[PDB]
Design a protein around this ligand. Sequence first.
Ligand code: MAN
Ligand code: MAN
Ligand code: MAN
Ligand code: MAN
Ligand code: MAN
Ligand code: MAN
Ligand code: MAN
Ligand code: MAN
Ligand code: CA
Ligand code: CA
Ligand code: CA
Ligand code: CA
Ligand code: CA
Ligand code: CA
Ligand code: CA
Ligand code: CA
Ligand code: CA
Ligand code: CA
Ligand code: CA
Ligand code: CA
Ligand code: CA
Ligand code: CA
Ligand code: CA
Ligand code: CA
Ligand code: CA
Ligand code: CA
Lengths: 412, 414
Amino acid sequence: PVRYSIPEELDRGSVVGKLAKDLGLSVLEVSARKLRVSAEKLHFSVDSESGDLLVKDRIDREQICKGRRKCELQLEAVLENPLNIFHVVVEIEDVNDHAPQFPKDEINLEISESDSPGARTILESAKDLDIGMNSLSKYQLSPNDYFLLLVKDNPDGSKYPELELQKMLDREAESTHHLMLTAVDGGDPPRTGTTQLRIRVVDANDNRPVFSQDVYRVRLPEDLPPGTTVLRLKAMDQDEGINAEFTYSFLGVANKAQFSLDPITGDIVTRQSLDFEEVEQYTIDVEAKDRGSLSSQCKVIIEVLDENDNRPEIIITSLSDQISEDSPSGTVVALFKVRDRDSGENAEVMCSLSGNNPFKIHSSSNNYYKLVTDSILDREQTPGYNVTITATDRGKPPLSSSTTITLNVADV
Amino acid sequence: QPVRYSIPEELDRGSVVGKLAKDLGLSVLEVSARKLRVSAEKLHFSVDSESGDLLVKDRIDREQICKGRRKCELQLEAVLENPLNIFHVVVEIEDVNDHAPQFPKDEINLEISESDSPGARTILESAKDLDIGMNSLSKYQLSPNDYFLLLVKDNPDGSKYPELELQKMLDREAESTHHLMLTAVDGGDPPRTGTTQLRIRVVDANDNRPVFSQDVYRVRLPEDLPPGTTVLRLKAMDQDEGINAEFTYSFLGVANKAQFSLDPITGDIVTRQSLDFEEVEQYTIDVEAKDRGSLSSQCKVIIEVLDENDNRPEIIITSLSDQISEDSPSGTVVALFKVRDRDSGENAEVMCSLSGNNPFKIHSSSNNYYKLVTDSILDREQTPGYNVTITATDRGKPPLSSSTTITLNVADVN
Ligand SMILES: *[C@H]1O[C@H](CO)[C@@H](O)[C@H](O)[C@@H]1O
Ligand SMILES: *[C@H]1O[C@H](CO)[C@@H](O)[C@H](O)[C@@H]1O
Ligand SMILES: *[C@H]1O[C@H](CO)[C@@H](O)[C@H](O)[C@@H]1O
Ligand SMILES: *[C@H]1O[C@H](CO)[C@@H](O)[C@H](O)[C@@H]1O
Ligand SMILES: *[C@H]1O[C@H](CO)[C@@H](O)[C@H](O)[C@@H]1O
Ligand SMILES: *[C@H]1O[C@H](CO)[C@@H](O)[C@H](O)[C@@H]1O
Ligand SMILES: *[C@H]1O[C@H](CO)[C@@H](O)[C@H](O)[C@@H]1O
Ligand SMILES: *[C@H]1O[C@H](CO)[C@@H](O)[C@H](O)[C@@H]1O
Ligand SMILES: [Ca+2]
Ligand SMILES: [Ca+2]
Ligand SMILES: [Ca+2]
Ligand SMILES: [Ca+2]
Ligand SMILES: [Ca+2]
Ligand SMILES: [Ca+2]
Ligand SMILES: [Ca+2]
Ligand SMILES: [Ca+2]
Ligand SMILES: [Ca+2]
Ligand SMILES: [Ca+2]
Ligand SMILES: [Ca+2]
Ligand SMILES: [Ca+2]
Ligand SMILES: [Ca+2]
Ligand SMILES: [Ca+2]
Ligand SMILES: [Ca+2]
Ligand SMILES: [Ca+2]
Ligand SMILES: [Ca+2]
Ligand SMILES: [Ca+2]
């Protein structure tokens, strides 16, 4: 069978080939023998004037052949008296008229921030109706720091592009990315189909909640009433949504014996008054944990200020009841000292006696005070003295405590 | 000038603090005659008349009376009577390493998120050492492991607290729970160690995407399969646990599920409309699995349709001659026709036959054209016209046959 070649999509009236001239049929014979050229679901014509094969229907190679490697239409021609049938084979040359194009111009992708580097995400492949050289040739994308592109082929022979990311993403730095994806076919001239990809990063739980300060310090007096909001804590989570909701908790145990913490507000209050003489300062560890297991710890130390709330006590360590009547001036009759629970200026003491007695009080080293008689005494005036001595503090407000003691002298 | 003595704590009763009477020169006569009393605040001491020395009466605990204070000086005093007098004594208590460092709790339970960034720090409860000075806490050390490293830092009060610094990020899909040893050692002779075992439980994060068993699924199906058929069941797993392990299947491609439906709970993919091999021979579909997060994984499922002999062959008469010459020789062509079958393969090959009563015979030219010629001469006087029935039968199971009846007439030139 005679074979001819013709590029597709040719204009009507184009000359495929001179098959009648190839068979040596004269114009008289072409006219006399009714010459009809037939193909399956197609029309062709031969005009009596030129007696050649001319196209009658615009032919699309991609419509009738699709993915077939080569296209050969087996047309036939009919002659009559004498009657005969002839077979001709026609090859349709492909023309790069169908540019590669993506199913959708805009492609939206949602990728998790927590995705590991080196992951792969398959994308919709491009479509090129052209076959062979004019088919799709290569995929290339806009250059970016985050992403790299790979091209792999599925079993039917088409090429699909998938994305491999070199560096893990972070929406707290850049939330959304826009990129350009291009597909190019191998032909002259080359045509390109472009689709812009919009990638939005969804929040993960990779940022821990962080306090404003690493160490919190506040100074409080021991007379502060319970229920007082001693401190307010501050913390923030750079995440968003469920991954950004956190609560405060006392990491230490038994430190909140008199303390309370509101995790909703972050507040720290006291439920029982403090005593400087018991514990001078508290060190507590408080940690914030979000809905995930991300937790962060900060240390809160508080110092208690001493207040003059403890009165001084007088203690007579020793005293002499039987005193000789001939005692001279400067004779020691009693010994005592003072004790104060407070500290600082609230601990220093100033003490005094009644003054009706001749007795005078001297101060020795430490806080020990000797009670002596400054003048000689006669028993006829008074045989025994009871003395009331007052000891007053030096802090605000001064606390004074007094003691009465009895001493008797007999002259024999 | 007050006399000073030094004594280690926790001494037995009857121990000699110092020879205060000989240091003051009182002698046994004055110690016995003049009532000598040794007094301190909240403490007891005794002087035996025979030796006239300072003896302890109460076991003294330096941590009890001093706690965190830098130095310990008990201000003793001595009292004499007739004549009565007071003397000042200062006694320093030397610390003895008798209190071992001990942590507040023996068992430490910690919950750490797998997604925690490497290099993070987590403060732990500090140990307590009642001893002051040298005998106080000195260093923290833990059992060596690849994931964790230990740091020791001091808070404002002067104590040492340990915090954990992570070198390599954890992964509970590899090892769920870790057990470690925390040790605190004080600087004394002999050194004492307080040890607490800490239990770390790694909590699941959303770092593992769900993955299918295979990347490419392929199945072959016949076109006669009824709709509603469960075409395939998909299998996939998420190495995470809990909410982060619940995922659904979805059609990544668009319009590919025109006749397909997918139940993501079971993972099933069914067909809702019958297929036609002559329309689309093979389907390529992209299916993706997505968890509660945006972690997604893609697999490609391609299916092939099997051709079934459901399309019978059609006979097409391209040309025919109504007036046939009576002088027609043997082998002259009276008709031309061809056969067309939509199917492919053996289901496309055809075998056709005619009645055979007529002299006509069919010989095959190129393609599927069978040129209808007459093998023998016929005369019109015997029979002027023939009815011819030609039957075309398929070659696939079950054979499909279609026939056409053409009329041929003979004309006499005379
Ligand atoms: C795609 O790329 C081709 C070159 O391969 C260009 O000619 C076209 O304009 C588009 O940019
Ligand atoms: C992407 O870019 C191409 C040019 O290369 C355009 O023709 C197309 O419409 C899309 O904007
Ligand atoms: C001792 O002195 C104080 C004032 O310093 C008084 O408030 C107290 O009642 C006592 O007389
Ligand atoms: C000094 O004053 C106190 C009261 O402040 C008395 O209790 C004491 O007996 C002395 O007279
Ligand atoms: C802690 O460490 C000290 C010195 O390393 C040991 O003496 C003690 O028994 C404990 O192991
Ligand atoms: C923890 O471990 C130490 C030794 O490191 C022991 O001495 C201690 O009694 C506890 O078992
Ligand atoms: C034509 O012939 C086939 C068998 O060759 C039959 O099955 C069909 O029904 C028709 O009669
Ligand atoms: C040709 O043969 C077919 C199949 O046998 C018949 O159905 C038809 O009527 C004609 O006789
Ligand atoms: Ca075209
Ligand atoms: Ca084309
Ligand atoms: Ca193309
Ligand atoms: Ca981040
Ligand atoms: Ca985040
Ligand atoms: Ca968080
Ligand atoms: Ca107080
Ligand atoms: Ca106080
Ligand atoms: Ca006071
Ligand atoms: Ca001790
Ligand atoms: Ca000790
Ligand atoms: Ca110790
Ligand atoms: Ca993991
Ligand atoms: Ca995980
Ligand atoms: Ca997951
Ligand atoms: Ca069918
Ligand atoms: Ca079929
Ligand atoms: Ca068939």
